[PDB]
């Protein structure tokens, strides 16, 4: 199956306190493997998964230098952006950045990303072809022009297509015991009438990895459903995930309805009966 | 209007235990990455400090050295008490904010020599030697030779000045100096350069030739005990006028 | 160091030829590479940088990067004596550059009309020394150090008097001994002509 590697950076200015809170996190698929928090005592890039602890001190020194560089560039950005948006020193503002790689089942490059946001909105992004910039407004055009003069997109093209996929491949290999696994979901059926009869029903799924699941409700019909409630995938903490989908049906005991569960690794699209 | 980086002082000769203060300035960019390297002979520059625009990023912790950045574009390397080991070629460099391809240029460097005993310091005696009439006749060319001898430490700057103007064409100055006393640990040095001009240009008595050697030495106030004038930083030169046959 | 390795040299190359300088790095995460040129007594000067596979040409310089073998090269075309210097390879291993110890290059000039000769120069008023100049010899001639004598002889030096469109090699020898003959000086290997 496909895989990805991505890094998330958030910097929040806190005027009247000092430097901005800066938090950086790295993921391989849905697994966090590194982090950096400007308020932590460590002041080092920290491992958050066993297979990354295999890298030597040279690697950690480098990641730490780079992540601090990122931090300080974002601190300069905060000052520059206030100017661009003609805003005051008193207000707290946020800068965000994300970039990464996607590869297919063949572990070959599929697509890259590099985007930036200001105060929760798109500011500038690198287009799908990794050659053009999507600038949100006038301020971002300024940035766009300087990033073009300095060939930022050529540099990111080199990182995203080469370095990021080469390292994604290395990480998948080093942690094949964890990253290259697949945990099947433990499904269930819960329907309570409690006070008023009218029975309901949702497809449970526990302890599954990765987080991608496409469960849906229907009875002997085609892929079309209409409801007003369902829950998004959520973390369990042990590294796994859990989700469900609700739909309303006629009163009485449990009727005859099929649940289509789609998850990777899983032998075949599971559909729990439980008619008692 | 463009990007520049300067460093000073250019050369220092200083006693063990002395304080150190090197400065680095940049112009044409803002919020740059600043770096202090130290280069030993026969080797590549080695990193002492890497400061980002808001503070230090590098984790190395040298001994006797500290860096500071009192202004965005001003970087300082200090020591309260130098060690013999601190001799070296100190280089400053910059790179644009972030992680990119912009910059990565060094300043002109600061050569530092730390000495245990100052009595070993001697400035160069300079002497110019005029063309042989033989060379003049076997070829329509004349080669002057300048000889800077008896200096220590060994990092002098030699130049030729023809009619008050620094010249370069036809100049050949030795890359490194030679030790006059090869087996001696504190041997003094010698350096030579040649200035080759045409016979017709030498013969003219109106042409003035001069060999100049900037020497870096002790400061006016360094401790001193010898019965000879203190060898401070100075320029020693020797002149020569043309000669028709 | 060991993180970035280059042969030390001196590497000799004829004038007009291509100089091939090589470099190996051991830091897998290196994403950019640089070449600096450093003249004796001077700070390094940037030549080029590269961050992608293959070749990158800038005038007579061509940097080549091969990440699989972790190799970086620099080719100088139509080498000249003014190219004589120490070439430093650096790797960016984060937010800084880590350098190799350099490879010293020496480009021997092509002497069109070698006419070796030893001359004794005349000195100004103060003359405790006698100075002997060995000049105009072919760039294939090596000048050996002074015999167990207290005379001095410099290594050969190359000068280009751009005006006369001419290049020349030189070596200077001197001594304060009275028995220091100029004809005897430079006793090593040549077939020049002594004046008088």
């Amino acid at each position: 199956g496909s895989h990805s590697m991505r890094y998330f950076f958030t910097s929040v200015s806190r005027p009247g306190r000092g430097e901005p809170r800066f938090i950086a996190v790295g993921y391989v698929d849905d697994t966090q493997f590194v982090r950096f928090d400007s308020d932590a005592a460590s002041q080092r890039m920290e491992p958050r998964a066993p297979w990354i602890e295999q890298e030597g001190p040279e690697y950690w020194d480098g990641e730490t230098r780079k992540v601090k560089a990122h931090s300080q560039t974002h601190r300069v950005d905060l000052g520059t952006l206030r100017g661009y948006y003609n805003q005051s020193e008193a207000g707290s503002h946020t800068v965000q950045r994300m970039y990464g790689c996607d590869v297919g089942s063949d572990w070959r490059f599929l697509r890259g990303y590099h985007q930036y946001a200001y105060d929760g909105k798109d500011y500038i992004a690198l287009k799908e072809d990794l050659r053009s910039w999507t600038a949100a407004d006038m301020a971002a055009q300024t940035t766009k022009h300087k990033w073009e003069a300095a060939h930022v997109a050529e540099q990111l093209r080199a990182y995203l297509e080469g370095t990021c996929v080469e390292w994604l491949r290395r990480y998948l290999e080093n942690g094949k015991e964890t990253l290259q696994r697949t945990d099947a979901p433990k499904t269930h059926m819960t329907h309570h009438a409690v006070s008023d009869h009218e029975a309901t029903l949702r497809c449970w799924a526990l302890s599954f990895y990765p987080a991608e699941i496409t469960l849906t409700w229907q009875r002997d019909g085609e892929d079309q459903t209409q409801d007003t409630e369902l829950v998004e995938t959520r973390p369990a903490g042990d590294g796994t995930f859990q989700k469900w989908a609700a739909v309303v049906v006629p009163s009485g005991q449990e009727q005859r309805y099929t649940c289509h569960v789609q998850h990777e690794g899983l032998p075949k699209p599971l559909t729990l009966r439980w008619e008692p | 209007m463009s990007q520049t980086i300067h460093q000073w002082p250019a050369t220092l000769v200083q006693p063990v235990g002395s304080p150190l203060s090197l400065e680095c300035t940049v112009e044409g960019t803002s919020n740059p990455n600043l770096y202090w390297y130290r280069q030993a002979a026969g080797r590549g520059p080695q990193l002492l400090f890497y400061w980002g625009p808001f503070g230090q990023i590098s984790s190395e912790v040298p001994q006797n050295l500290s860096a500071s950045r009192p202004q965005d574009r001003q970087f300082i390397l200090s020591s309260k008490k130098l060690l013999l080991s601190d001799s070296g070629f100190y280089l400053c460099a910059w790179s644009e904010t972030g992680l990119g391809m912009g910059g990565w240029q060094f300043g002109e460097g600061s050569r530092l020599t730390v000495l245990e005993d100052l009595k070993n310091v001697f400035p160069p005696e300079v002497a110019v030697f005029e063309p042989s009439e033989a060379e003049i006749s076997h070829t329509q060319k004349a080669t002057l030779v300048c000889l800077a001898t008896g200096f220590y430490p060994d990092h002098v700057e030699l130049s030729w000045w023809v009619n008050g103007k620094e010249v370069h064409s036809g100049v050949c100055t030795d890359p490194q100096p030679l030790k006059e006393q090869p087996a001696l640990n504190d041997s003094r040095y010698a350096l030579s350069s040649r200035l080759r001009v045409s016979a017709t240009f030498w013969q003219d008595p109106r042409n003035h030739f001069r060999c100049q050697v900037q020497f870096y030495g002790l400061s006016e106030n360094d401790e001193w005990t010898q019965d000879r004038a203190k060898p401070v930083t100075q320029i020693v030169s020797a002149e020569a006028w043309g000669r028709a046959d | 160091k060991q993180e970035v390795e280059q042969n030390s040299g001196p590497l000799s190359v004829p004038e007009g030829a291509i100089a091939s300088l090589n470099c190996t790095y051991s830091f897998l995460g290196s994403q950019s590479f640089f070449w600096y040129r450093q003249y004796s007594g001077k700070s390094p000067e940037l030549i080029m940088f590269t961050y992608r596979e293959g070749d990158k040409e800038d005038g007579r310089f061509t940097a080549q990067l091969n990440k699989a073998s972790q190799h970086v090269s620099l080719l100088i075309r139509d080498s000249q004596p003014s190219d004589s210097a120490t070439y430093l390879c650096a790797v960016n291993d984060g937010g800084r550059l880590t350098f190799g110890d350099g490879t010293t290059l020496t480009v021997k000039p092509n002497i069109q009309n070698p006419d070796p000769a030893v001359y004794q120069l005349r000195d100004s008023k103060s003359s405790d020394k006698s100075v002997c100049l060995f000049t105009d010899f072919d760039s294939q001639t090596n000048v050996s150090q002074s015999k167990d004598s207290d005379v001095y002889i410099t290594d050969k030096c190359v000068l280009d008097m751009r005006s006369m469109d001419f290049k020349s090699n030189s070596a200077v020898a001197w001594s304060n001994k009275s028995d220091f003959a100029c004809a005897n000086a430079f006793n090593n290997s040549i077939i020049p002509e002594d004046t008088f």
């Binding site: 500011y123 990111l156 | - | 995460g29």
Partner: peptide, 10 residues
């Protein structure tokens, strides 16, 4: 492996 190039200020 963090990017070590293409990261500039806005």
């Amino acid at each position: 492996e963090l990017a070590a190039i293409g990261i500039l200020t806005v």
